[PDB]
């Protein structure tokens, strides 16, 4: 049976000789795939072996079925590297598994002759959909499905993929790479902390390393925004979406650019000096730079000012949750131009969908008010889980208690033997074993992400530098001004993180910069804008002359 062959693939399927690290591995599919042509939306895919199946098929304490699904793609002609893509939301879907590299790239890892694997995280959105437990978050009712969503799925699938690669090619992967954003960023940080030898290079974008506190931020932003809300929904809950119109947010963005844009030495619609900007900008006293007057309404509301009740609300929301002792429960958020943005008539919805939701609606549709995020908190991250009908959820965020409810992400209860911060949190700065075997980590984060605070990622990185002096030799953070959650918004949101990760791990060449470019250069009225991403705490500084949309006219440097 020759290696890297149609027969080697088929043989992975019986009483055949394949030895899985987990004896409860079942292969459903082992198929040979012809090389696929490039399309408008994807690079050409090489000829490869597709293996799909499931690990640890079992019944939950909720009577639902559970398994850890995986999909593995092993090219006939292999570059010797193994690649795993991270998830998003609460997972539950099995992707095509060509190896997404994020940063809006056309190319998959499979398109570069990597072996590629993905998992659903140990539940299935089609089968683990419980109308009495808020839908696709229903996995949280099973304790093991929690541990699988947190850490165990990624572990079992990594071991199984590497075993499948070793058998199919008759040698082990020279190096292994993981790339994820959001929940996938949490997974990459979890891997560096709990499974240091699983991956040699990790890219962790907009990482939910404190994901169980998102619901607490969410409750807070909701309660903070309820006073500026106009009108009610069917259940009598204020319409958080009506707190700010798209034009209102655009004004907020224009006022932030007014005080902050030029602090990097260049008026360009981009706040490169995020730190000077947080020191300098207060919506209660800043100028609307169009009419020279206070951003905050002196009299009645107009198009060209925001009301006191609105300034109060957004300020309280961005400061972040505290309990009655005044202990911070998450973190504060960065003022940035990416809270809105204009391309043609189109208003950036990227920022507002998280806390406010769509202005144009009879109902609340915010992620953190009534959407997936608030539901996930109640069923997945609170112990014990609080299932309820979907229409009670927004009310529950309004009547959330910052002294009782936050304790529940630290709590254990009956069969829930680990807290959500135990199994989902990835807060450890003990990365010595990762560092010392030659592991490299690239973190990136959009400054205008409303899912997770770029400044919370930065504080993790400060705490990593303090615990492990010299940390920049193995881990670097690239903050992206303007960028929303993983993509979108008025910034250079597009980049190839994979090439510089491979260079760091294999050649020891640290990224002093990473080229990025805007997916919507409409926001700056140009056809193209390219800029260096800079390693924290460095920022992009214009050299003094040249086209402002060209990366060669920018250096990475310390802030003034
Ligand atoms: O994408 C990714 C992503 C994954 C999860 C969330 C979230 O907020 O739910 C958490 C409730 O504490 C947001 C973005
Ligand atoms: Ca600027």
Swiss-Prot record:
Biotech use, per record: Has potential for application in environmental remediation and biological recycling of PET waste products.
Domain of life the protein comes from: Bacteria
Its membrane topology: Lipid-anchor
Summarize the impact of residue 381 to N: Gains a low activity towards BHET (bis-(2-hydroxyethyl) terephthalate)
Q: Which reaction does it catalyse?
A: 4-[(2-hydroxyethoxy)carbonyl]benzoate + H2O = terephthalate + ethylene glycol + H(+)
Example of a GO MF term: metal ion binding
Q: Where in the cell is it found?
A: Cell outer membrane
Which miscellaneous remark does the UniProt record hold? The calcium ion is located far from the active site and appears to have a role in stabilization of the lid domain.
Q: What does this protein do?
A: Involved in the degradation and assimilation of the plastic poly(ethylene terephthalate) (PET), which allows I.sakaiensis to use PET as its major energy and carbon source for growth. Likely acts synergistically with PETase to depolymerize PET. Catalyzes the hydrolysis of mono(2-hydroxyethyl) terephthalate (MHET) into its two environmentally benign monomers, terephthalate and ethylene glycol.
The name under which this protein is listed is Mono(2-hydroxyethyl) terephthalate hydrolase
Q: Which organism is it from?
A: Piscinibacter sakaiensis
């Amino acid at each position: 049976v020759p290696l890297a062959s149609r027969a080697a693939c088929e043989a992975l399927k019986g009483n055949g000789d394949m030895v899985w690290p987990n004896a409860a591995t079942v292969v459903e599919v082992a198929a040979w795939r012809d090389a696929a042509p490039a399309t408008a939306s994807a690079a050409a895919l090489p000829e490869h072996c597709e293996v799909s199946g499931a690990i640890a098929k079992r019944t939950g304490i909720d009577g639902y079925p559970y398994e850890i699904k995986f999909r593995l793609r092993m090219p006939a002609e292999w570059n010797g590297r193994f690649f795993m893509e991270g998830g998003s939301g609460t997972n539950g879907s099995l992707s095509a598994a060509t190896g997404s590299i994020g940063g809006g790239q056309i190319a998959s890892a499979l398109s570069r002759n990597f072996a590629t694997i993905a998992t659903d995280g140990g539940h299935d959105n089609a089968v683990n959909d419980n109308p009495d437990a808020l839908g696709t978050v229903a996995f949280g009712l099973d304790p093991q499905a929690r541990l699988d969503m947190g850490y165990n799925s990624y572990d079992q699938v990594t071991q199984a993929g590497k075993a499948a690669v070793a058998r199919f090619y008759g040698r082990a992967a020279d190096k292994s790479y993981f790339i994820g954003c959001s929940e996938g960023g949490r997974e990459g940080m979890m891997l560096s902390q709990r499974f240091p030898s699983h991956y040699d290079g990790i890219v962790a974008g907009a990482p939910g390393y404190q994901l169980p506190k998102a619901g607490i931020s969410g409750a807070w932003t909701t309660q903070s925004l309820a006073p500026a809300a106009v009108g009610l929904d069917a259940q009598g809950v204020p319409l958080i979406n009506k707190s700010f119109s798209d034009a209102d947010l655009h004004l907020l963005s224009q006022a932030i650019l007014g005080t902050c844009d030029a602090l990097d030495g260049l008026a360009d619609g981009i706040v490169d000096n995020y730190r000077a900007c947080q020191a300098a900008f207060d919506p209660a006293t800043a100028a609307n730079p169009a009419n020279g007057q206070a951003l905050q309404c002196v009299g009645a509301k107009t198009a060209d000012c925001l009301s006191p009740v609105q300034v109060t609300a957004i300020k309280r929301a961005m400061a972040g949750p505290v309990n009655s002792a005044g202990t911070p429960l998450y973190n504060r958020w960065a003022w940035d131009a990416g809270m809105s943005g204009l391309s043609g008539t189109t208003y950036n919805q990227g920022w507002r969908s998280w806390w406010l939701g769509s202005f144009n609606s009879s109902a609340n549709n915010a992620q953190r008010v009534s959407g997936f995020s608030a539901r996930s908190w109640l069923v997945d991250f609170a112990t014990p889980p609080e299932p309820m009908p979907m229409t009670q959820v927004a009310a529950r965020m309004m009547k959330f208690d910052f002294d009782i409810d936050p304790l529940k992400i630290w709590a254990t209860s009956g069969q829930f033997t680990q807290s959500s911060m135990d199994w989902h949190g990835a807060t450890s700065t003990d990365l010595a074993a990762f560092r010392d075997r030659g592991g490299k980590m690239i973190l990136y984060h959009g400054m205008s992400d409303a899912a997770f605070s770029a400044l919370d990622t930065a504080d993790y990185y400060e705490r990593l530098g303090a615990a492990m002096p010299g940390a920049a030799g193995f881990a670097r953070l690239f903050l992206v001004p303007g960028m929303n959650h993983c993509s979108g918004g008025p910034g250079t949101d597009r980049f190839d993180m994979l090439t510089p990760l491979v260079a760091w791990v294999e050649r020891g060449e640290a990224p002093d910069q990473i080229s990025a470019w805007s997916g919507t250069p409409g926001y700056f009225g140009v056809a193209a804008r390219t800029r260096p991403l800079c390693p924290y705490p460095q920022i992009a500084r214009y050299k003094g002359s040249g086209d402002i949309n060209t990366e060669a006219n920018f250096a990475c440097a310390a802030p003034p």
